[PDB]
Amino acid sequence: TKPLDGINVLDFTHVQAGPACTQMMGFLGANVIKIERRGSGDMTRGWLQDKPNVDSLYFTMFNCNKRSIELDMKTPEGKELLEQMIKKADVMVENFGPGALDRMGFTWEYIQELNPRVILASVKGYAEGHANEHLKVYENVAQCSGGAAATTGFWDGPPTVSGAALGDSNSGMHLMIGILAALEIRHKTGRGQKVAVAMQDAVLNLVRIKLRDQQRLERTGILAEYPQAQPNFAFDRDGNPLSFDNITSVPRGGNAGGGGQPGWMLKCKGWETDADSYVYFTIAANMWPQICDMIDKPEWKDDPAYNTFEGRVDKLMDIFSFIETKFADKDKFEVTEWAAQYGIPCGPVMSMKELAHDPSLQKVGTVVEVVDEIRGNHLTVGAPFKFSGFQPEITRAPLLGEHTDEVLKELGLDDAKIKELHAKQVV
Amino acid sequence: TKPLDGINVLDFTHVQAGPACTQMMGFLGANVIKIERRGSGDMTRGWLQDKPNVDSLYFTMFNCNKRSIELDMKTPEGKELLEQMIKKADVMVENFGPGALDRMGFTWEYIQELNPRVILASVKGYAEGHANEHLKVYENVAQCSGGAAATTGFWDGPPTVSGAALGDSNSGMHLMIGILAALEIRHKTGRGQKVAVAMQDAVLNLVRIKLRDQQRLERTGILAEYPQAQPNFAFDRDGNPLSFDNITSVPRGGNAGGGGQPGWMLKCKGWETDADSYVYFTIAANMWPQICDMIDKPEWKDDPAYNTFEGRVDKLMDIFSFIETKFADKDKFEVTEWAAQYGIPCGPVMSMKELAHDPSLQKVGTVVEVVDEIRGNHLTVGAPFKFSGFQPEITRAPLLGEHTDEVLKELGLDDAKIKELHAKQVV
Numbered sequence: 127t128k129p130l131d132g133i134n135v136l137d138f139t140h141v142q143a144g145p146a147c148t149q150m151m152g153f154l155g156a157n158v159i160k161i162e163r164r165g166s167g168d169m170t171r172g173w174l175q176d177k178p179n180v181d182s183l184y185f186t187m188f189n190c191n192k193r194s195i196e197l198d199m200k201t202p203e204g205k206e207l208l209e210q211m212i213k214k215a216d217v218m219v220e221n222f223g224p225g226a227l228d229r230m231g232f233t234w235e236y237i238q239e240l241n242p243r244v245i246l247a248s249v250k251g252y253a254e255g256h257a258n259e260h261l262k263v264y265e266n267v268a269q270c271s272g273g274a275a276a277t278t279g280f281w282d283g284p285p286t287v288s289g290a291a292l293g294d295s296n297s298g299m300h301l302m303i304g305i306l307a308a309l310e311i312r313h314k315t316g317r318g319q320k321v322a323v324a325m326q327d328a329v330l331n332l333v334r335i336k337l338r339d340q341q342r343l344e345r346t347g348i349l350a351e352y353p354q355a356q357p358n359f360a361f362d363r364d365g366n367p368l369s370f371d372n373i374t375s376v377p378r379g380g381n382a383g384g385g386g387q388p389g390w391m392l393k394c395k396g397w398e399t400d401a402d403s404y405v406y407f408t409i410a411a412n413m414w415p416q417i418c419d420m421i422d423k424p425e426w427k428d429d430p431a432y433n434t435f436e437g438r439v440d441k442l443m444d445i446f447s448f449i450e451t452k453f454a455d456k457d458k459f460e461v462t463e464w465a466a467q468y469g470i471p472c473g474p475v476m477s478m479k480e481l482a483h484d485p486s487l488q489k490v491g492t493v494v495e496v497v498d499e500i501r502g503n504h505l506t507v508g509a510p511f512k513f514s515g516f517q518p519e520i521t522r523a524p525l526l527g528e529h530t531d532e533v534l535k536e537l538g539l540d541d542a543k544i545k546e547l548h549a550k551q552v553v
Numbered sequence: 554t555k556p557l558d559g560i561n562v563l564d565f566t567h568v569q570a571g572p573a574c575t576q577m578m579g580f581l582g583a584n585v586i587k588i589e590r591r592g593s594g595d596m597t598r599g600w601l602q603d604k605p606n607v608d609s610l611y612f613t614m615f616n617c618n619k620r621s622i623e624l625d626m627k628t629p630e631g632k633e634l635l636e637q638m639i640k641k642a643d644v645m646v647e648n649f650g651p652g653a654l655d656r657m658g659f660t661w662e663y664i665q666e667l668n669p670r671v672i673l674a675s676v677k678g679y680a681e682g683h684a685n686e687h688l689k690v691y692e693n694v695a696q697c698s699g700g701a702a703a704t705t706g707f708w709d710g711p712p713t714v715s716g717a718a719l720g721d722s723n724s725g726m727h728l729m730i731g732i733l734a735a736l737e738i739r740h741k742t743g744r745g746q747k748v749a750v751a752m753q754d755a756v757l758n759l760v761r762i763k764l765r766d767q768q769r770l771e772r773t774g775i776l777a778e779y780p781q782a783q784p785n786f787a788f789d790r791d792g793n794p795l796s797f798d799n800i801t802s803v804p805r806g807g808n809a810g811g812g813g814q815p816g817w818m819l820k821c822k823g824w825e826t827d828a829d830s831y832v833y834f835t836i837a838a839n840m841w842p843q844i845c846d847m848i849d850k851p852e853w854k855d856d857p858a859y860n861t862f863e864g865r866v867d868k869l870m871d872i873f874s875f876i877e878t879k880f881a882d883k884d885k886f887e888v889t890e891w892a893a894q895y896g897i898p899c900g901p902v903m904s905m906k907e908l909a910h911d912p913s914l915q916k917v918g919t920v921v922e923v924v925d926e927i928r929g930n931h932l933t934v935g936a937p938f939k940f941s942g943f944q945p946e947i948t949r950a951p952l953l954g955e956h957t958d959e960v961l962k963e964l965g966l967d968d969a970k971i972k973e974l975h976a977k978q979v980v
């Protein structure tokens with residue numbers, strides 16, 4: 127009915143990486159109890175707010191399907207409460223930076239003694255045992271540490287950060303694989319495990335195709351399909367030409383295909399006026415004829431300077447310029463619909479405005495209107511996994527300490543034991 | 554002792570998205586049996602080969618921990634073998650493009666009739682029921698459909714793809730979450746499920762913070778922390794300033810922070826000839842004092858134009874421009890180490906060559922040497938999740954059809970039948 131119904135998650139996480147993971151577990155039915163610092167709670171609450179003294183969108187789009195309890199974990203009575211909650215939890219999730227939980231008294235070793243069944247899941251910057259184990263890491267630092275930044279953007283520009291959250295949310299989703307894997311192993315052992323994802327490794331996993339390319343480069347000295355391998359196409363900022371004579375580490379390739387077969391980002395009508403008025407167009411080698419028909423170049427079906435991967439390298443960027451020319455007069459949608467007639471893989475650059483209001487994404491539950499009576503409704507990204515046997519029921523993100531008392535009742539605490547704790551500045 | 558021990562995966566997948574997912578399952582212990590086209594098989598085998606007549610690195614770095622059987626599924630005899638295999642399978646992963654398996658005869662409904670326990674997992678371009686459900690989609694096409702390209706690169710350049718495989722490996726990791734969540738649910742119901750991830754939605758899920766930004770922009774007309782909101786810093790290509798006056802959809806922000814904590818990509822010594830000689834440098838709020846001592850500008854500790862996020866977010870670029878000057882004569886690693894002395898969140902852009910031979914990434918098992926006695930050893934990325942109770946065991950990718958016979962014999966077949974199928978050109 128819902129894969130994580132009845133899994134309870136003691137969630138210590140803050141910001142993006144850890145909360146993204148617990149939220150998505152929440153969307154699959156887990157009972158996520160989020161533990162927050164007394165007074166402020168999760169930073170994201172006060173970051174980039176749109177209305178004052180209202181939880182930010184940063185917070186709400188990463189914290190639906192959870193309850194909040196405030197807790198000072200430095201206090202004798204808070205540690206006592208934690209022990210009870212650990213005994214009821216299936217997974218504890220944390221992204222606190224190294225040794226921190228151990229310093230609260232909750233080493234993996236003691237946790238095992240409190241609940242041999244509980245899984246301990248962590249996000250960190252670097253793996254345990256890495257020389258950089260101790261370094262401090264946010265989204266873009268991890269994109270840098272993991273290879274994305276070096277391999278993204280252009281040959282004549284800097285390393286470029288990706289808009290997508292290659293380091294926070296992607297670590298989050300990786301962690302969520304770890305957690306589920308550990309739940310799968312517990313069915314056979316009766317025991318919990320420790321599991322950790324490092325932002326660098328999560329990034330690296332997504333840039334695995336670039337570690338393909340580094341080895342290709344080391345062994346052959348060239349990467350035929352990169353723009354720098356087309357003679358006198360690519361120039362550094364001083365007008366000097368670029369080739370694989372000089373390159374010993376995988377370079378930026380602009381809008382080249384990557385793991386996609388050859389491709390490029392082509393202008394559509396209005397690109398001067400509209401930043402996102404562009405398609406991506408792919409030359410699959412198996413599609414050469416189809417493409418010649420579309421662009422009205424029958425002469426290129428048989429010329430061997432044009433009809434194999436190999437002949438095409440001499441000229442790839444000239445081909446792409448010539449295709450661009452046909453799109454000169456059509457918006458990205460006309461171009462995608464035209465391309466689709468030929469089966470060619472080609473699609474528009476969707477702007478975020480287009481995405482936030484697309485009827486298709488709301489039909490399938492991928493953009494979702496969350497009903498929030500307190501802060502006002504708001505959009506969010508649902509579950510990118512679709513299942514035959516159930517639908518996520520997303521509900522609004524918790525207010526600070528909203529559920530503190532309700533959670534203490536589920537633990538078995540009389541109403542005056544709760545009164546004590548508020549006054550003691552534990553909760 | 555290995556989370557997917559005894560899970561049997563009927564793997565139909567090719568290229569990157571699907572295989573990434575089944576490979577990672579194989580690392581966690583799954584019995585992955587890859588079905589391949591008679592004669593050529595997975596097209597990655599012959600795409601960017603480094604040695605002739607040898608499976609490429611693209612194939613080997615996405616197809617460890619699997620066996621190969623060749624099979625013609627359009628044949629009566631091959632459908633019969635498929636039915637037998639589906640009855641032994643726990644999960645059946647596919648990325649064929651829509652309706653394809655249904656046309657082979659294996660609709661979800663017949664599959665259930667064969668095995669009410671099997672999970673059917675799919676990668677698709679767009680979600681079932683989306684207007685674009687039928688479009689063909691590779692890596693960078695999905696990056697475009699999902700919002701990443703629109704929000705990646707610079708305000709004065711084109712939408713830009715990421716070097717990270719946001720569309721393929723990303724999608725395959727999200728699928729892997731769907732698969733594990735379905736295995737968790739099957740312990741409770743005894744039943745399999747259908748599960749699908751669309752590349753558009755996998756991308757969009759990593760781009761959630763950009764949906765936060767769209768809504769902030771819609772509600773307030775401005776994004777204070779984006780470069781375009783510091784007066785006269787940002788210019789479009791032909792001499793004209795840029796502001797949020799004109800911007801209704803989240804724009805490209807160069808190497809801005811992404812979140813609530815501003816950062817930039819900063820030149821280090823050697824940048825004019827070394828593409829990856831840069832550092833990312835994040836102004837955390839709490840860390841401004843320490844930033845002021847590393848810099849040796851102590852005037853900024855009490856100047857309110859300088860010591861608050863509100864004070865800071867109109868001179869932000871001037872500030873990075875001056876921190877950058879401190880780094881002109883030091884490298885990457887020097888700068889980072891200077892910055893760790895103050896717990897400042899700063900790190901190097903790692904190059905792919907630095908990462909390919911980094912000793913830490915090899916010690917923690919994230920870059921792993923694969924022992925491949927037929928093609929030569931090669932590197933690959935291993936498990937990004939680290940577990941206290943087991944270690945993945947990485948084992949080389951299969952030769953086309955290497956395991957056909959072996960797998961037919963596990964299907965209870967007879968050595969006469971086997972040699973008949975080879976001859977009948979079905980295997």
Ligand SMILES: CC(C)(COP(=O)(O)OP(=O)(O)OC[C@H]1O[C@@H](n2cnc3c(N)ncnc32)[C@H](O)[C@@H]1OP(=O)(O)O)[C@@H](O)C(=O)NCCC(=O)NCCS
Pocket residue numbers: 140141142143144161162163164197198199200221222223226227229249250251261262263264265294325
């Ligand atoms: C995000 C990150 C950089 C934030 O750093 P930070 O502002 O220093 O916050 P910390 O996580 O280190 O926690 C602050 C301290 O207060 C403690 N603390 C936090 N909440 C508490 C509470 N509810 N009660 C008592 N103590 C608490 C922590 O144990 C920690 O203790 P310490 O002084 O012994 O180190 C850090 O958590 C991190 O690098 N984690 C891994 C990677 C990551 O998630 N970063 C990207 C952000 S999405």
